[PDB]
Design a protein around this ligand. Sequence first.
Ligand SMILES: NCC1=CC[C@@H](N)[C@@H](O)O1
Length: 297
Amino acid sequence: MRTYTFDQVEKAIEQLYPDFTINTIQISGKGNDCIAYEINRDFIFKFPKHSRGSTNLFNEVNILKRIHNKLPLPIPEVVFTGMPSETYQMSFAGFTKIKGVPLTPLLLNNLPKQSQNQAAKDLARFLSELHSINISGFKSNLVLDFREKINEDNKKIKKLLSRELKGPQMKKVDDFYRDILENEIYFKYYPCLIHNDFSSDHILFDTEKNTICGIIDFGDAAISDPDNDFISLMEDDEEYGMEFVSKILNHYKHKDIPTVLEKYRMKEKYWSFEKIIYGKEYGYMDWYEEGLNEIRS
Ligand SMILES: NCC1=CC[C@@H](N)[C@@H](O)O1
């Protein structure tokens, strides 16, 4: 997990774009993979915090570029690109800023039942279109082999929980990894392009028109189960309700909501194991302990 100063950032941009003038610069946000800088008022630059971050940055650029004018809501446009380095596919990248504020659940539930439904309608239209873009030209690296992932995780988990679990706990885990892997509902799906981190903080809203005016943060975008773009909004309190996601599902004409519900349940259980893995990948001891705790109950 590496760090940047403001001058390091200015320097990094100047050296590739010497004729770009930075008048103002502020940190607008930061996640696991990237720190984000608001440049002038018009641009968001992401700098990666590690190798994997950089790859996901690279992946965001290529995906934004290839869907640039293809969707019914605005989305970031790539304008500046950085360079490969030793272990980083992409030293930085610079995107247009999209006007709007996050469509928090709070902001959502304070909208009249009308503007609520329009937002649900508009989200279903964005998703339908995202999940319909033709996937044929996309390289294997831009897809998620989900069974390969669960197996990858399974191995990692054994390496890490060797010596943290009793054999009978470690077996309650084996049984979970096999209950999943012997269930085709998780893998028998029409893969398509997805946002894959589709959540209220990445949905921008125009309070003047009380309409959605943007979608951001395509770093995790990949070719995968279209259901994942609904499951990421279902969480109560943190995200929208279950009731609201049904509204979206129906404008979207999803023909099997109970399967979506089942995926959601699994996902929630599964998060303890991801916390463990990511806790170590990223160096979040707290995530690691939380994961360990939930597992022990
Ligand atoms: N359910 C917890 C949860 C899962 C997805 C994660 N990105 C987390 O932020 O919320």
